[PDB]
């Protein structure tokens, strides 16, 4: 491919890896209520605190 195209290809692979990590993290957060039911700890562990 052109350099232009190869650059987008490379960045897309990074974005795909990030997407996989995000899905894994989301599945972890889904299962938190099984073990922790204090909603403040859930907010912390889930990362929701970062969005207030």
């Amino acid at each position: 491919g052109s350099p232009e195209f190869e650059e987008q290809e490379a960045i897309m692979k990074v974005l795909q890896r990030d997407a996989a990590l995000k899905r894994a993290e989301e599945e972890r957060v889904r299962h938190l209520p099984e073990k922790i039911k204090d909603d403040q700890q859930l907010k912390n562990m889930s990362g929701q605190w970062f969005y207030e």
């Binding site: 650059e7 490379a10 960045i11 990074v14 972890r28 912390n44 990362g47």
Partner: protein, 185 residues
């Protein structure tokens, strides 16, 4: 998924200052001498245990952290892409090159960009003066960098991605700052 918190940081600074090397040294304990410039953006990961009050004993106290360490390109052709990623980072590792005065003089401009585009106007930043192993090529005086860091109220570490000096220090500091912010809020 055997961890407790996903913490996301981002490394920024001019092209060539050592952002990729710093992160790779931290996550893998390795260093490459050949300059392989970053194609827009990349990230690395590391699983660590955060212990705010020091070592525990028989009862495990630590918080298991999965670190995602975003690695941005410094060249201006990627500036819009990399700026887009500033808003989702919880804290910043801001680098300059001890052997390159201009990268240091650009620190004020990078901070201004973070204040505009970060999640907060006053985000947690750790300043790293990198390539400390290259003393014969040094162009930035420690005291000058400390003075700058002092004005902004940010920690300053002099680091080497070559041998690892102060790398874990700088990143653990940044981790401590965001975990305390979580505690605060």
């Amino acid at each position: 998924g055997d961890y407790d918190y996903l913490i996301k940081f981002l490394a920024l600074g001019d092209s060539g200052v050592g952002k990729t090397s710093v992160l790779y040294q931290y996550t893998d304990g390795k260093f490459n001498s050949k300059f392989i410039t970053t194609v827009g953006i990349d990230f690395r990961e590391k699983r660590v245990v955060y212990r705010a009050n020091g070592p525990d004993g028989a009862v495990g106290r630590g918080q298991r952290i999965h670190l995602q360490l975003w690695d941005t390109a410094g060249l201006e052709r990627f500036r819009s892409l990399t700026t887009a990623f500033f808003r989702d980072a919880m804290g910043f590792l801001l680098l300059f090159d001890l052997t390159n005065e201009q990268s240091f003089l650009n620190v004020r401009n990078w901070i201004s960009q973070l204040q505009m585009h970060a999640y907060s106007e006053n985000p947690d930043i750790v300043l790293c003066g990198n390539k400390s192993d290259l003393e014969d090529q040094r162009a930035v005086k420690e005291e000058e960098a400390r003075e700058l860091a002092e004005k902004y109220g940010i920690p300053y570490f002099e680091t080497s991605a070559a041998n690892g000096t102060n790398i874990s220090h700088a990143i653990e500091m940044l981790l401590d700052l965001i975990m305390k912010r979580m505690e605060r809020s």
